[PDB]
Amino acid sequence: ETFKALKEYREGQHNDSYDEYEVNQSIYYPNGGDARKFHSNAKPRAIQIIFSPSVNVRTIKM
Amino acid sequence: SNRDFAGREQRLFNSEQYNYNNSLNGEVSVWVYAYYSDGSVLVINKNSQYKVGISETFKALKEYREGQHNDSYDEYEVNQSIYYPNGGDARKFHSNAKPRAIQIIFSPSVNVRTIKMAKGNAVSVPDEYLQRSHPWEATGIKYRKIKRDGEIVGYSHYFELPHEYNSISLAVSGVHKNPSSYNVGCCHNVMDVFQSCDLALRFCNRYWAELELVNHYISPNAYPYLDINNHSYGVALSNRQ
Amino acid sequence: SNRDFAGREQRLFNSEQYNYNNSLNGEVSVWVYAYYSDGSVLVINKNSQYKVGISETFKALKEYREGQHNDSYDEYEVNQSIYYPNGGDARKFHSNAKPRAIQIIFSPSVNVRTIKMAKGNAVSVPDEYLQRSHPWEATGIKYRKIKRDGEIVGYSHYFELPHEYNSISLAVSGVHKNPSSYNVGCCHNVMDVFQSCDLALRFCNRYWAELELVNHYISPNAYPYLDINNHSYGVALSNRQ
Amino acid sequence: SNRDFAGREQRLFNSEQYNYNNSLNGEVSVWVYAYYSDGSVLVINKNSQYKVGISETFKALKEYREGQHNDSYDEYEVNQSIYYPNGGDARKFHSNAKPRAIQIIFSPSVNVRTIKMAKGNAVSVPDEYLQRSHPWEATGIKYRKIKRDGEIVGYSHYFELPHEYNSISLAVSGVHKNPSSYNVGCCHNVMDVFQSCDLALRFCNRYWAELELVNHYISPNAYPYLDINNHSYGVALSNRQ
């Protein structure tokens, strides 16, 4: 997944989508965007990766 | 030499400012900063003679973006679900409009031993139920000195609300220092204190970032501030050029 | 036997709550309920030491549905036509946002003989013209005791506004009981009363139904209430388990 | 002298970067640039081990302005009229969302003789009808060397779509150089190549101008680029300080 793909999207609701295009520009390059916020609440705070028990753990790559 | 009058006058002008603020004729000021997860900061300020304070509701402290969308219907429901568990029909677990932290700052003209705070729950009860609530706590011992160049420019109480259950209403109050035996609320002056309650000037604004707050609110007005990095701001004036 | 310490401690814990609220260190509280024709109810609450009150405008008491439509342009015009007959261009005869009734409740820690109300007209004049207005009426004699299990848990004044002409502004005030000869506003403590004005916590919310109000506001907080059916709510604590 | 270790280490650090990218452990990268008549540029990038590629539909290559209007209903119809002549009910002759040109760039770690492109029609057929389509063309001979300071920093294939009939789908593929006799897809390593297909990182963004692209995408990331003026960008690292 891309940076953008991992950002919170609320299906059928408002998303600040124009402002969040700008958030992206300001994340790709410092001061590259014209976002009206310091920190986008759509950014993930944490990630968890889970594999089924049928994986071989020594093959996992990230 | 002692013939540098420009130098002596500069030192006096700064010392006079320091002392005037600290006189009974001077201001006492309080600021409440509410920090949001989007990095924006709400400031409420009040400036009065004699004594000063601020009192806000749970709802009032929630982030409001002027001229923008706010999930206002959903955030009515968020309120219902905060006032009573499972009382609302919000489409979210945690409202990002809730403050993550609060900082209270007083001008250096406050007497710290007079500071009082009522930090209530979301329905404005200081201590669980009204029947067992003392209506305030005296929190002066927790205030840190904001210093610049050796001079106390302010007092700060900072506290986080990092848990889901930290849903608060908030009032704070402080009295102007008075090392005299003259009671500013005695019969001779008490009507002037009543008038000062009308005369107090209030200010409220939301800044997009703590950087804007520092650059365009704190600094231009020679206000004290303590930032998230524990850095002090303000201007030392006592016997200084 | 007298060796049931769980029993004695339970009785003491409840009696202590009752008495603490009634001490000079305790809360006094007021609630204003405005009842609308759609069955919704607005509550305003204030909780303070020493004395407490609420003051609202005509406009402030009108039903507002947060996050919804409100005929807000038409309701500006409704206001103009209420301030002066034929002053507005409203597209309705009667605004359903006007309260149909008001109930004022005080905590049992109020002294009832201190209660004062200023029920003004829609332009905030207590008695027709300012020049002949006493600025309040002492209405304590009209307050009914809200009782539970023999104990006064509250005081209620209920009045309807069933006529087209009942278009009101409203303020109410009460003082915490004080059977002592210590005047909480004497010179020794008067600055603390000034601070209590800053420290007072306010709460405001609109509930869809009196059932929600009872279930999710009154009951969870051990508040007193008297419903439209004349039924009392609250919790008796004096010498009770 | 040969005792300038800062100098020798700087040269080694740059040479190591150059060589690591070119090793079997290193990246191979492709970029597709689509140029629009409003001067905006869409970039798609993919970065993987072993081999890498990009495949997009006709629709996917059309300009999309995030958070803005796009004539999206009319542009559904534009699609219908491009898939089959007179198949749609578009209110325009030529959609300005169609790319005017394409540039394909590969990192210098590609083997140019492995590059393959399938440039299809708008319904994703490489050569008029499926029955007579070879599914790709080997286009490496057409790639120009992007050079900086004597060093090949990239490879560019640039082509215009200046005619109304240039309505395309597009896929491109290249394999990481491997001058060894070790086949990275042999049985010993083939599962790692399968994993590399999952591990590949993709990036997509639309820049308002080629100036923004150069300033804030190409340059900060030390990527190669060839601009509309035939100017080269990138960073030479082989045996250089």
Coordinates of C-alpha atoms in Angstrom, one line a residue, chain B residues 9 46 59 87 90 133 135 171 175 199 225:
Chain B
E9 CA 15.9 56.0 31.4
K46 CA -8.9 37.1 30.3
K59 CA -18.5 21.4 24.7
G87 CA -26.3 7.8 25.6
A90 CA -22.1 8.9 17.3
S133 CA -17.8 18.1 45.7
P135 CA -16.0 23.4 44.4
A171 CA -12.7 26.8 35.5
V175 CA -6.1 37.0 42.6
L199 CA -14.4 45.6 32.8
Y225 CA 4.5 30.8 27.3

